[PDB]
Ligand binder design. Structure first.
Ligand SMILES: *[C@@H]1O[C@H](CO)[C@@H](O[C@@H]2O[C@H](CO)[C@@H](O[C@@H]3O[C@H](CO[C@H]4O[C@H](CO[C@H]5O[C@H](CO)[C@@H](O)[C@H](O)[C@@H]5O)[C@@H](O)[C@H](O)[C@@H]4O)[C@@H](O)[C@H](O[C@H]4O[C@H](CO)[C@@H](O)[C@H](O)[C@@H]4O)[C@@H]3O)[C@H](O)[C@H]2NC(C)=O)[C@H](O)[C@H]1NC(C)=O
Ligand SMILES: *[C@@H]1O[C@H](CO)[C@@H](O[C@@H]2O[C@H](CO)[C@@H](O[C@@H]3O[C@H](CO[C@H]4O[C@H](CO)[C@@H](O)[C@H](O)[C@@H]4O)[C@@H](O)[C@H](O[C@H]4O[C@H](CO)[C@@H](O)[C@H](O)[C@@H]4O)[C@@H]3O)[C@H](O)[C@H]2NC(C)=O)[C@H](O)[C@H]1NC(C)=O
Ligand SMILES: CCCCCCCC/C=C\CCCCCCCC(=O)OC[C@H](COP(=O)(O)OCC[N+](C)(C)C)OC(=O)CCCCCCC/C=C\CCCCCCCC
Ligand SMILES: CCCCCCCCCCCCCCCCCC(=O)OC[C@H](COP(=O)([O-])OCC[N+](C)(C)C)OC(=O)CCCCCCCCCCCCCCCCC
Ligand SMILES: CCCCCCCCCCCCCCCCCC(=O)OC[C@H](COP(=O)([O-])OCC[N+](C)(C)C)OC(=O)CCCCCCCCCCCCCCCCC
Ligand SMILES: CCCCCCCCCCCCCCCCCC(=O)OC[C@H](COP(=O)([O-])OCC[N+](C)(C)C)OC(=O)CCCCCCCCCCCCCCCCC
Ligand SMILES: CC(C)CCC[C@@H](C)[C@H]1CC[C@H]2[C@@H]3CC=C4C[C@@H](O)CC[C@]4(C)[C@H]3CC[C@]12C
Ligand SMILES: CC(C)CCC[C@@H](C)[C@H]1CC[C@H]2[C@@H]3CC=C4C[C@@H](O)CC[C@]4(C)[C@H]3CC[C@]12C
Ligand SMILES: CC(C)CCC[C@@H](C)[C@H]1CC[C@H]2[C@@H]3CC=C4C[C@@H](O)CC[C@]4(C)[C@H]3CC[C@]12C
Ligand SMILES: [Mn+2]
Ligand SMILES: [Mn+2]
Ligand SMILES: [Mn+2]
Lengths: 995, 35, 291
């Protein structure tokens, strides 16, 4: 595919050379407020939606015809053609012929029409519902119109709109950078290299690709933020001309449908083999050439489960919709089946397990623990707000902060207003605003010279401020970060106003307080400041941010601040169900090991009794190195240890541990953990929200991206989108994933059961030489006419009570169609259904004059159209049509017996583990099918004219009840089998019949 | 004539049953309050 | 070869020997109990019907008219000059007629002589075993004029004069009732005996009515039909050697080497017809003596 670096470098013509005035006058857009909504709609209706031209859609009369003349329908079409041709051949011969062959062909044609219409109805429902996901959660673009910044639909972006993107944002369309602050974009999808290139408003290169003032479509902003103006939208984008004609998807193989295709090909091969063998058998038995094709068609129909693919599609789409309604959006149809096989869930602590709603609750200053944040009753705090150390703590907690309040918020309290920044920064803002004063004034007095944001390299924040006081050296450095790391960067501490050297006793007390607050499940943050000497740093001294010149160490530690972030509601229950379903859950967070350990123990990650190496050492008062590593079922792996570990140690920890928690782990290390988990042969599901998680989301089997706080990079790099970022949703999705397998297997076990009772009559008719008990017209009305709705009703069944109490399934060994399934549909239920039909057949023939014993071998004269003196068991003589009416009545009775046994089969198929009395008949579609098939059979048997149209005759009442005992037998046998499987798990019954 | 079985009686019974079952199934599939 | 057999656990075709035997024994007790329950239900069902009267007879009503010899497509074409072209028809006629010879009807307890002329029906009573077997109205082949297998074994096939013996479908408990003289205005002219169920052969098209020739009806007492004294039939349990009444028709003075379809139709109150079953009450025979 020579579509990159060749079809892109030459088709390029931009306006990056235009200045702010030239750009404003050319595109006509308010560079500071954006276009007006009226103009926005005008351009949307002028140029069209911001999207690529979609592929041509086949009309409604194309799919209907392609289904009407499909593969399986072709056999019936040829059968009807042969019948019409034979009727014409008979019309040329002997005058006053019969209309048997003509009626047979008309019946086959009507059957083909009904089958095609039902198949088209289900295919239309599937395609329409599938399309519903493409419009579930559309991608949004943050644009600026009429001065206000609003989030609109991506397709509603027009040329010239003032667009703003940030870290993790997907580029809506080709833009012209107007304002930018350290923006980094990734052109891997454009030029090939994944190296992030910076973007700046300044004109740097004449080539559009190399310039720094242009953001192209489909690229993503990795770090920073910028504002641009749309220069091309829709198909006019540079990357659009390539993505519309050279980026089409390939033939992704779905294993859930591929396995059914393989089983379908095998069953089709065996069915066609039996059909041809019986075709030659009948031809040899002195039968009409058309009757041979009739028997062949009947055998193929009754042996090929032609609706399996439709059942698979219905089950998959239905469960996809279920997951969508339960906050689980599946991006592709393959992930819907990988969910049922999930065995390891690497979730995060902040954002997924918790609600990320932090609240300042405890603090540590003056070597004391202080509770605060009164219930907004103006009670203040539990300490005096005049404490000297508290002033130095609030100063660095408000100045070093980077979050600010938005407008229209001075009319409601601080504990319920809106902020703009980090959750930690929001909690700190609401704290200093509820017990200190106004930050707008404090941050104004202490003007900030240079600030260092939170970086993984530094692991701390930084802010240099000029102090407007008189007894200070005009320079105040403030910084917050990891309490442990902030402590190592300081040499003194403030105690009630006096600064004193940080000795071992103070550090030990700090560690005690840290363990105390961390065991409470709270994230603690360290704060410190330094009054740099004025002699070395005068008033005119300029602190360099790129070249660190000011002292970074030997600062003055002020205090600790901790906030509470309670876990989600259903999280304890979710982890409980996961532990009860054999799914290993791993917590992946960047918090302190004490806080991560306490939160994990509280939410259920580390259940009671389990202890880590550190806990055992502290319990027996022995060095951790002396403790046996295998004696701890759970562990808290630190980030530093994960970095200095090898694949061997990783497999060791991930292998001999049941509850693992990775703390202080950077988001980039998630890839190694996912690889190690997959190395243990497990289907991993990983949660991600940032841009650095992308490797972990793409490498994992099931990437789950946060739908609320997650950025576009995570959403496009994942396989499922969590609509509410609730961990319980992952468990719900896993359950639905297991539900698709359960219902698909239950449906297969039912569609295949009808095979033995529908094909055995021919075998006995040929081996025992008795009159045909089941005809082809009856077989068609059964398979293609009555079991079309019941076969699908098994998809709408609900889940059993043990769906979350069984071990996960591995696709390498557990398949849908297994030997135990065949042993059930073909060996036990099928045999009972066949015996029931045969019983009703013998009852009708014996009640009409032919005893069961005498019927052996009479088929030769039975089918003979000239031996009109057949002697019955009582010695009476029958004609040809007289006895054929009885044979057809037997066919209708066999059909009724089939429906009767189908009732019991459908009922017992509602559940494969529990009893029908525990599951209940909550399936409305199943009951609908139960009523509709019985009514359809009754109509086909009692409607006037059917005796000469479908060759189906009225059935006497004392016959509708002949197959009832076989139905009850099937019911009681399946219930006792399930009862033995319930009372003796892992028993022979389970290892032999549990499909 | 002990050679004629009243078939119209059974036919009407079966048709009535088919209609009843069809109406019930139609009400179940198109349920207004059967959730 | 791995799936075919593996020596590690002694697995043949997919499963080991222990499991092979476990499933074989389980399937034996299962299929055995299933066939046993099947046979049990079959016997319980047999205990519902009677042994000398079927529970339902509407399916065989009215009876169907049949012809002897049974010929494919009801076509009887042979070369009168050829001594073998008519061997099949005569063979099938004799195979059935031998059951009516005077030798088969020797025992007087089973075979009783009934009126030489049409009389009233011989109602034997009730359909039970209180009187054991029932007598059988004897029927001598001599009642058939020239085709009886007594004087002419060819039955007329040798001189282009076929004799297609007509027969009535045996039905248990059927009491034939011939048409009354009051309504006699549509069926053709024939002897009117209120004690005989008549049958009349006619052509089928305008050409058939002309090329048929001269019908010669032979029956008990010279009446074109079946005497009412030979009914009702009590089945093979009460009258095993029961002989049904017969009647033949001779086609003399017919067009040589021409296919002719004739239809013999039985009349009576309880004798109906059908559009789909061309053998219920009437039957059509196609003949062509290609000499
Ligand atoms: C089907 O069964 C019937 C049963 O009745 C058979 O009917 C016979 O048909 C033949 C052929 O038409 C007739 O023959 C005609 O006889 C006329 C005069 O016959 C008189 O004498 C008879 C008695 O003497 C004969 O019969 C006894 C036994 O009954 C014999 O033992 C004896 O030896 C004699 O042979 C009387 O019974 C009869 O009533 C008369 O009084 C002839 O006039 C006639 O000849 C004409 O037709 C010829 C054919 O075209 C023609 O060539 C001549 O020139 C002439 O014009 C003909 O020979 C019998 O009368 C008739 N009845 C009997 C009892 O035989 C019929 O034969 C049989 N079908 C077949 C194929 O066998
Ligand atoms: C019952 O069956 C008999 C036998 O088939 C029919 O009578 C005829 O019998 C003779 C046998 O000797 C058949 O064979 C011959 O047919 C020849 C064909 O000519 C026909 O056409 C002319 C028209 O110009 C007619 O006039 C003529 O009669 C034929 O019908 C004849 O040339 C033969 O002539 C011999 O018979 C005639 C008349 O009997 C004598 O006068 C002559 O001297 C000569 O001996 C001879 O007829 C003939 O085909 C049979 N006729 C048929 C079959 O129609 C009876 O007719 C049939 N009964 C009825 C009611 O149809
Ligand atoms: C997308 C939609 C899906 C729909 C699915 C449902 C499909 C329903 C199938 C058929 C509907 C039937 C409609 C009503 C038919 C009755 C018409 C009628 O009023 O007829 C009355 C007469 C009765 O006469 P009588 O009682 O005096 O009998 C005396 C005859 N004696 C003496 C020989 C016994 O009958 C006659 O004369 C003529 C008889 C004509 C009977 C027509 C029945 C259909 C025939 C061909 C179509 C085949 C469709 C098969 C579909 C199967 C799907 C599984
Ligand atoms: C003249 C008589 C002719 C009789 C012909 C009888 C034909 C009977 C067959 C009817 C339809 C069968 C359809 C099978 C479809 C299987 C589809 C499939 O993928 O199955 C996979 C499944 C296997 O599932 P799997 O392949 O997914 O899993 C494999 C698991 N391991 C690897 C462990 C094995 O097939 C089976 O389990 C085997 C089924 C064998 C069925 C054998 C039937 C034999 C019939 C004997 C009749 C004898 C009559 C004697 C009469 C005497 C009269 C006097
Ligand atoms: C004119 C004819 C009209 C015909 C209408 C035909 C409708 C046919 C549709 C279904 C009927 C056939 C299948 C019935 C399946 C019942 C399955 C079951 O057990 O459901 C349990 C379930 C049990 O669930 P539950 O919800 O009641 O209990 C739940 C309990 N917990 C909460 C603890 C889990 O209930 C039902 O399905 C309710 C309806 C039961 C209807 C039973 C009818 C048959 C009754 C006895 C069997 C036949 C005896 C015949 C004796 C004859 C003597 C001469
Ligand atoms: C003289 C007696 C004559 C009886 C004639 C037949 C009468 C009808 C027979 C059964 C109808 C009533 C069934 C009640 C079933 C249990 C309902 C229930 O919810 O129990 C919950 C219990 C389950 O309770 P659970 O605790 O799991 O669920 C409740 C959970 N909470 C509390 C949270 C809601 O049901 C079972 O365990 C069912 C075990 C069934 C084992 C069956 C073995 C035999 C196979 C079939 C039995 C016979 C069927 C009918 C045959 C009829 C033949 C004519
Ligand atoms: C009524 C008579 C003639 C038919 C008897 C059929 C017998 C020979 C056939 C019918 C279906 C067959 C079974 C079909 C499926 C399986 C499952 C497999 O894992 C072991 C063999 C086993 C259990 C087969 C054994 C042979 C079997 C039971
Ligand atoms: C409760 C469950 C197991 C039983 C299922 C309902 C059974 C009893 C129903 C299903 C269909 C019904 C039949 C439908 C039509 C007819 C024709 C009518 O002229 C006589 C009654 C008869 C023969 C009905 C008898 C009752 C019947 C057999
Ligand atoms: C407690 C359990 C085992 C009782 C089982 C009873 C069985 C033997 C009964 C229940 C229903 C019965 C059937 C009901 C209806 C008919 C139709 C009739 O015209 C002939 C008998 C026949 C075919 C019956 C045979 C015996 C039968 C199958
Ligand atoms: Mn993250
Ligand atoms: Mn993926
Ligand atoms: Mn089926």
């Amino acid at each position: 595919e020579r579509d990159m670096d060749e079809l892109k470098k030459e088709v390029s013509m931009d306006d990056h050379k235009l200045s702010l005035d030239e750009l404003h006058r050319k595109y006509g857009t308010d560079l500071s407020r954006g276009l007006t909504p009226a103009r926005a709609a005008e351009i949307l209706a002028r140029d069209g939606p911001n999207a690529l031209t979609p592929p041509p859609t086949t009309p409604e009369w194309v799919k209907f015809c392609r289904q009407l003349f499909g593969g399986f329908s072709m056999l019936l079409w040829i059968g009807a053609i042969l019948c019409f041709l034979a009727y014409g051949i008979q019309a040329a011969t002997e005058e006053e012929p019969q209309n048997d062959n003509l009626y047979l062909g008309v019946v086959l044609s009507a059957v083909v029409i009904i089958t095609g219409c039902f198949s088209y109805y289900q295919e239309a429902k599937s395609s329409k519902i599938m399309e519903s996901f493409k419009n579930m959660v559309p991608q949004q673009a943050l644009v600026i119109r009429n001065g206000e910044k609003m989030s609109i639909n991506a397709e509603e972006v027009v040329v010239g709109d003032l667009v703003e993107v940030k870290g993790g944002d997907r580029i809506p369309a080709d833009l012209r950078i107007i304002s930018a602050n350290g923006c980094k974009v990734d052109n891997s999808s454009l030029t090939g290299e994944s190296e992030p290139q910076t973007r700046s408003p300044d004109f740097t290169n004449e080539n559009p690709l190399e310039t720094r003032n242009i953001a192209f479509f489909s690229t993503n902003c990795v770090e920073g933020t910028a504002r641009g103006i749309v220069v091309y939208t829709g198909d006019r984008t540079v990357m659009g001309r390539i993505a519309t004609l050279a980026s089409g998807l390939e033939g992704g193989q779905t294993p859930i449908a591929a396995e059914i295709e393989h089983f379908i090909h095998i069953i089709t091969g065996v069915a066609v083999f039996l059909g041809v063998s019986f075709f030659i058998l009948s031809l040899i038995l002195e039968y009409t050439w058309l009757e041979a094709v009739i028997f062949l068609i009947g055998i193929i129909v009754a042996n090929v489960p032609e609706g399996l693919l439709a059942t698979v599609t219905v089950c998959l789409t239905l469960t996809a919709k279920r997951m969508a309604r339960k906050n689980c959006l599946v991006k592709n149809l393959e992930a819907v089946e990988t969910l049922g096989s999930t065995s390891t869930i690497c979730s995060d602590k902040t954002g997924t397990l918790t609600q990320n709603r932090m609240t300042v609750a405890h603090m540590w200053f003056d070597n004391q623990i202080h509770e605060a944040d009164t219930t907004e009753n103006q009670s203040g705090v539990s300490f005096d707000k005049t404490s000297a150390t508290w002033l130095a703590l609030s100063r660095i907690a408000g100045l070093c902060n980077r979050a600010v309040f938005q407008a229209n918020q001075e009319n409601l309290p601080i504990l319920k207003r809106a902020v703009a920044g980090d959750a930690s920064e929001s909690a700190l803002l609401k704290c200093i605003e509820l017990c200190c004063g106004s930050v707008k004034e404090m941050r104004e007095r202490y003007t900030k010279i240079v600030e260092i944001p939170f970086n993984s390299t530094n692991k701390y924040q930084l802010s240099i401020h000029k102090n407007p006081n008189t007894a200070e050296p005009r320079h105040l450095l403030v910084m917050k970060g990891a309490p442990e790391r902030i402590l190592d960067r300081c040499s003194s501490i403030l105690i009630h106003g006096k600064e004193q050297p940080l000795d071992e006793e103070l550090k030990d007390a700090f560690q005690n307080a840290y363990l105390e607050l961390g065991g409470l499940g709270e994230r603690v943050l360290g704060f410190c400041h330094l009054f740099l000497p004025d002699e070395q740093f005068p008033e005119g001294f300029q602190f360099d941010t790129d070249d660190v010149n000011f002292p970074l160490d030997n600062l003055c530690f002020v205090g600790l601040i901790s906030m509470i972030d309670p876990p989600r509601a259903a999280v304890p229950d979710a982890v409980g169900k996961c532990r009860s379903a054999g799914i290993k859950v791993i917590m992946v967070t960047g918090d302190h090991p004490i806080t991560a350990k306490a939160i994990a123990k509280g939410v259920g990650i580390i259940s009671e009794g389990n202890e880590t190496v550190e806990d055992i050492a502290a319990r027996l008062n022995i060095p951790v190195s002396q403790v046996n590593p295998r004696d701890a079922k759970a562990c808290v792996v630190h980030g530093s240890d994960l970095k200095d570990m090898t694949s061997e140690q990783l497999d060791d920890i991930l292998k001999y541990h049941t509850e693992i928690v990775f703390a202080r782990t950077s988001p980039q290390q998630k890839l190694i953990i996912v690889e190690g988990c997959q190395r243990q042969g497990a289907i991993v599901a990983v949660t991600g929200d940032g841009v650095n998680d992308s490797p972990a989301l793409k490498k994992a089997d099931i990437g789950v991206a946060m739908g609320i706080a997650g950025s576009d990079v995570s959403k496009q790099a994942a396989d499922m989108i969590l609509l509410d970022d609730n961990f319980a949703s992952i468990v719900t999705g896993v359950e639905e994933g297991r539900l698709i397998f359960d219902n698909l297997k239950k449906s297969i076990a039912y569609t295949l059961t009808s095979n033995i009772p529908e094909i055995t009559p021919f075998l006995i008719f040929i081996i025992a030489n008795i009159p045909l008990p089941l005809g082809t017209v009856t077989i068609l009305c059964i398979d293609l006419g009555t079991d079309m709705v019941p076969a699908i009703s098994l998809a709408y069944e609900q889940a059993e009570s043990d769906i979350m109490k069984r071990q996960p399934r591995n696709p390498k060994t557990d398949k849908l169609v297994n030997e135990r399934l065949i042993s059930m549909a073909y060996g036990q239920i099928g045999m009972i259904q066949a015996l029931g039909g045969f019983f009703t057949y013998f009852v009708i023939l014996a009640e009409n004059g032919f005893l069961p014993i005498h019927l052996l071998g009479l088929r030769v004269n039975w089918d003979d159209r000239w031996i009109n003196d057949v002697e019955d068991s009582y010695g009476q003589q029958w004609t040809y049509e007289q006895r054929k009416i009885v044979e057809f009545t037997c066919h209708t009775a066999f059909f009724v017996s089939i429906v009767v046994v189908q009732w019991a089969d459908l009922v017992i198929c509602k559940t494969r583990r529990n009893s029908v009395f525990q599951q209940g008949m909550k399936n409305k579609i199943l009951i609908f099918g139960l009523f509709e098939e019985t009514a359809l059979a009754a109509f086909l048997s009692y409607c006037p004219g059917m005796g000469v149209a479908l060759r189906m005759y009225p059935l006497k009442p004392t016959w509708w009840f002949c197959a009832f005992p076989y139905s009850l037998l099937i019911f009681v046998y399946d219930e006792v089998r399930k009862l033995i499987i319930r009372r003796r798990p892992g028993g022979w019954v389970e290892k032999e019949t549990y499909y | 004539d002990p050679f004629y079985y009243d078939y119209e009686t059974v036919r009407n019974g079966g048709l009535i049953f088919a209609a009843l079952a069809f109406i019930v199934g139609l009400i179940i599939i198109l349920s207004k309050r059967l959730r | 070869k791995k799936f075919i057999w593996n020596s590690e656990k002694k697995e043949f075709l997919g499963r080991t020997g222990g499991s092979w035997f476990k499933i074989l024994l389980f399937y034996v007790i299962f299929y055995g109990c299933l066939a046993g329950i099947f046979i049990g239900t079959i016997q319980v069902m047999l205990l519902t019907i009677s042994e000398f009267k079927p529970t339902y007879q509407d399916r065989v009503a009215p009876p169907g008219l049949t012809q002897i010899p049974q010929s494919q497509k009801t076509e009887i074409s042979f070369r009168p000059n050829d001594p073998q072209s008519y061997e099949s028809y005569v063979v099938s006629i004799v195979r059935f007629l031998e059951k009516y010879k005077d030798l088969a009807q020797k025992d007087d307890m089973i075979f009783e002589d009934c009126g030489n002329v049409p009389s009233e029906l011989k109602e034997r009573g009730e359909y039970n075993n209180e009187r054991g077997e029932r007598k059988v109205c004897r029927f001598r082949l001599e009642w058939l004029g020239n085709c009886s297998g007594l004087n002419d074994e060819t039955y007329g096939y040798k001189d282009g004069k076929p004799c297609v013996i007509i027969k009535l479908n045996r039905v248990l408990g059927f009491k034939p009732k011939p048409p009354k003289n009051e309504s006699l205005e549509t069926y053709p002219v024939m002897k009117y005996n209120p004690y005989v169920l008549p049958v009349h052969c006619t052509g089928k098209r305008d050409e058939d009515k002309e090329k048929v020739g001269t019908m010669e009806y032979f029956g008990l007492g010279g009446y074109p039909g079946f005497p009412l004294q030979y009914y009702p039939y009590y089945g093979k349990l009460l009258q095993p050697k029961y002989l049904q009444p017969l009647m033949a028709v001779q086609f003399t003075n017919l067009t040589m080497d021409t296919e002719i379809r004739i239809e013999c139709k039985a009349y009576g109150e309880n004798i109906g017809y059908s559009e789909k079953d061309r053998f219920q009450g009437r039957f059509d025979v196609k003949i062509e003596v290609k000499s």
